[PDB]
């Protein structure tokens, strides 16, 4: 239990932060991503990659929707920099930018099974880089033609389970990363 909810997340006042928005079951009902990597290790590495760039990291839990795009949007609304990072319990991640259409983004990582802890550090770093309004080289495209054949069914099931913790109208909750 490395995550503690500390009241409704408020909008950011300074542009030196990047919000990490995680699904309603992240760190709770589910504790590892689709390929076993612990949520704790993932968040830690994402946090690390962000701060490593001189930017603050603020973690919140979204409930209005389990869809990673909307989770990220709920986050970029509260982000002082306008940049956020959505992550589903199963691992799927996205770099969003306040102002972009929900299903649009700066960078997307559509194949959770392929993300490593180094990748998650890279994601946090580029996010922090976008917060500083720079133009970082996109994190190398990971693509495995057999990713779906091996994990789509599992992916759907994990998502089915996380979606059970979705609460309509319930605003994000800032979290204390223990």
């Amino acid at each position: 239990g490395f995550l503690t909810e500390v009241g409704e997340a408020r909008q950011g006042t300074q542009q030196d932060e990047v919000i990490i928005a995680v699904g309603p079951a992240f760190g709770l009902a589910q504790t590892v991503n689709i390929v076993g990597i612990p949520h704790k290790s993932i968040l830690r590495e994402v946090i690390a990659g962000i701060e490593e760039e001189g930017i603050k990291a603020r973690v919140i839990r979204c409930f209005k929707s389990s869809d990673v795009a909307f989770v990220a949007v709920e986050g970029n609304r509260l982000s002082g920099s306008g940049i956020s990072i959505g992550i589903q319990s199963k691992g799927t991640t996205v770099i969003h930018q306040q102002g972009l259409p929900p299903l649009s983004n700066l960078e997307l990582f559509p194949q959770a099974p392929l993300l490593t802890l180094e990748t998650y550090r890279q994601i946090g770093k580029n996010a922090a880089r976008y917060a500083k309004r720079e133009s970082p080289q996109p994190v190398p495209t990971l693509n495995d033609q057999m990713a779906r054949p091996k994990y789509q069914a599992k992916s759907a099931i994990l998502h089915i389970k996380e979606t059970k913790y979705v609460v309509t109208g319930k605003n994000p909750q800032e979290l204390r990363v223990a």
């Binding site: 869809d67 795009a69 649009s104 495209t141 693509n143 033609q145 779906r148 789509q152 759907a156 089915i160």
Partner: protein
């Protein structure tokens, strides 16, 4: 103690595939689920009050949309009373005309039609699809992408795909901001391979619409729709937003279709306890209701969900059949990876290949799968020779043809030089002769020189932000010494003005000749009738590489 027999079997690729046991509560069942609604229709004063056991007071946006626009209420009650087995029989009966069928099916409710096709085995379904397919002539659609969103490669591969026979080609991006470049490369290459080949760039809805408005695409296919309200919501649309979007594409003279597919609701968390087939049926009707001419279905990108459960692939063919039977153009998937087995994927493909559909594959990968940005196709560049061989073996027109290296090389080169001239003209990050030659002989991005992604990304966005349209491309080509290609680009633009290609199943063949379900009506009436592989086409299919003459 281990049985060597089972150890050999355990190493088999097919055992790497994802398999699951039916989970009826979460809709993880392909078709014929017990939670699926029984067919019913209750109409009062020309308005449905009950749809498949559901009262209008409970209709969600999908029910409302379907009930009001998707069913011919004039014959609805009549057809509902008809026996589903009798109807299924009529679908595969070679002597019941397609024109006799359509008036009946287009009057059925989602549950009704699903009940009908479910009385069928795959052989009967194929027998029916060859008759229900809207266009008389079958066709093919290919993917043209690469992990680097490299424009030179796209142009070359697109030219080859077009040369091999694909009448529709689709690209997409690893890095969104690259889109404008991919689209243009795809469009330029395709026209060099064969003028008339329609092209699309699959992006987020709003973004894709603007790209079509700027003139960098010929049509749009991935205009998504979903089987349940909550999933449609996370899809960021409603039946009305999509219906509006469909009319918007048409108002700009662009052909379009929706995209759906069994398993998406499951993949997105809300199946509402229904079977993949029933929910997909709702999408098919959503499509009909909106006035969209065709639909890309057959699970498509979520192929891993229905294939993991019993009768999954049989359900995929069934949804393609529901589509055609509903008098809609059907781009029958066979565009996504779902197995490590060649045997398994072949079986899945033959379901549409054998009888033929408007687009046998709605995304056969024209590049090796490592470059396929849709995470892998059910077929790819390396299967080209096998596909032409199966065509020859079964005397089945798969829409493709054997080709000569010398020809491919030439066309790929002309497409690289053409795009080079386009980039120079529009003042975009240059395409060097190295890149051109590289693209001429490549098999994939691994063979392509690394490009300045950060620079391209910039100019790519500029085309959007400064509304740089396709005319700039036509002129660059003309002044670059590619008068012919510029004219071709112009001709494709003229097609948008006439609206002929906006009709069901339309594609452009020969010399700018539209070929749709309107002027190429499928007239199947049993053996020796309907489309038949023969003449020069058969000769073309027969001449594959390696055929030696015994004399």
């Amino acid at each position: 103690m281990r049985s060597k027999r089972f150890e050999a079997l355990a190493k088999r690729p097919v055992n790497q595939d994802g398999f699951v046991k039916e989970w009826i509560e979460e809709g993880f069942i392909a078709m014929e689920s017990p939670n699926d609604p029984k067919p019913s229709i209750k109409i009062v004063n020309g308005a449905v009050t009950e749809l498949d056991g559901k009262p209008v007071s409970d209709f969600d946006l999908i029910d409302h949309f379907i009930a009001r626009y998707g069913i011919n209420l004039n014959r609805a009650e009549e057809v509902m009373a008809m026996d589903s087995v009798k109807l299924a029989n009529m679908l595969c009966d070679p002597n019941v005309k397609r024109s006799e069928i359509v008036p009946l099916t287009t009057a059925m409710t989602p549950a009704k039609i699903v009940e009908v096709v479910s009385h069928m085995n795959v052989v009967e379904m194929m027998m029916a699809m060859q008759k229900m397919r809207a266009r008389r002539t079958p066709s093919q659609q290919a993917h043209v992408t690469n992990v680097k969103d490299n424009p030179v490669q796209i142009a070359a591969d697109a030219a080859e795909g077009a040369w091999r026979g694909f009448d529709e080609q689709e690209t997409t991006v690893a890095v969104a901001r690259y889109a404008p470049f991919n689209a243009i490369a795809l469009l330029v290459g395709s026209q060099v391979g064969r003028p008339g080949v329609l092209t699309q760039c699959s992006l987020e809805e709003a973004t894709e619409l603007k790209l079509g408005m700027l003139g960098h695409t010929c049509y749009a296919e991935t205009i998504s729709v979903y089987g349940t309200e909550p999933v449609f919501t996370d899809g960021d649309d409603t039946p009305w937003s999509k219906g509006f979007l469909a009319s918007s594409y048409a108002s700009r003279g662009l052909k379009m279709r929706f995209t759906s597919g069994s398993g998406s609701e499951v993949q997105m968390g809300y199946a509402e306890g229904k079977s993949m087939l029933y929910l997909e049926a709702r999408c098919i009707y959503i499509t009909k209701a909106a006035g969209v001419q065709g639909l890309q279905n057959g699970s498509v990108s979520c192929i891993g969900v229905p294939s993991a459960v019993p009768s999954g692939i049989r359900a995929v063919l069934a949804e393609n059949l529901i589509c055609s039977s509903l008098d809609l153009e059907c781009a029958s998937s066979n565009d996504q990876t779902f197995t490590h087995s060649d045997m398994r994927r072949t079986a899945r493909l033959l379901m549409q290949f054998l009888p033929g559909t408007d687009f046998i594959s709605s995304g056969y990968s024209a590049v090796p799968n490592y470059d396929n940005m849709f995470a892998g196709s059910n077929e790819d560049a390396e299967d080209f020779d096998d596909y032409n061989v199966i065509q020859r073996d079964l005397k089945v027109d798969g829409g493709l043809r054997p080709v000569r290296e010398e020809d491919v090389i030439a066309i790929r080169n002309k497409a690289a030089r053409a795009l080079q001239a386009v980039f120079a003209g529009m003042g975009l990050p240059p395409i060097t002769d190295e890149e051109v030659e590289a693209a001429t002989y490549a098999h994939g991005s691994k063979d392509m020189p690394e490009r300045n992604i950060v620079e391209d990304i910039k100019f790519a966005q500029e085309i959007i932000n400064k509304n740089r349209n396709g005319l700039e491309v036509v002129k660059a080509l003309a002044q670059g010494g590619f008068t012919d290609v510029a004219q071709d680009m112009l001709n494709i633009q003229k097609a948008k003005l006439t609206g002929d290609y906006l009709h069901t199943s339309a594609i452009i063949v020969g010399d700018g000749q539209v070929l749709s379900a309107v002027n190429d009506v499928n007239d199947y009436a049993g053996p020796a009738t309907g489309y038949r592989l023969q003449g020069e086409r058969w000769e073309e299919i027969k001449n594959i590489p390696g055929a030696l003459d015994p004399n």
